[PDB]
């Protein structure tokens, strides 16, 4: 679970960058999409922290 956690905490930063790269092109319709991808990664990363601390 420690390996999985480190993947998703860096995959989210990829999508955070790609969102800002869309707003500088004004393409809000695409920035919202990248933010939606980020959200579900942050939500599941919190599940690993809870699981790992218990284990």
């Amino acid at each position: 679970t420690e390996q999985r956690l480190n993947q998703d905490t860096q995959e989210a930063k990829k999508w955070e960058d790609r969102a800002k790269l869309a707003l500088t092109n004004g393409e809000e319709n695409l920035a919202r999409e990248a933010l939606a991808r980020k959200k579900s990664l942050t939500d599941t990363a919190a599940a690993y922290q809870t699981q790992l601390a218990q284990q």
């Binding site: 969102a19 800002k20 707003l23 319709n29 920035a31 919202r32 999409e33 933010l35 939606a36 959200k39």
Partner: protein, 49 residues
């Protein structure tokens, strides 16, 4: 020719009726709205940068 024109018009109306009626319903009818994505708040926060 007259008899076969009427079959075409029956096909067309049957197809349009089902598609029009399938155009109703909340999931489709909301999918036509631009801000439906639900991330508008964090977009507004990002726009603070």
């Amino acid at each position: 020719f007259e008899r076969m024109e009427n079959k075409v018009l029956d096909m067309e109306a049957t197809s349009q009726a089902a598609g029009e009626l399938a155009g109703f319903g909340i999931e489709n009818q909301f999918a036509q709205l631009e801000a439906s994505s639900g991330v508008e708040d964090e977009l507004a926060a990002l726009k603070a940068s």
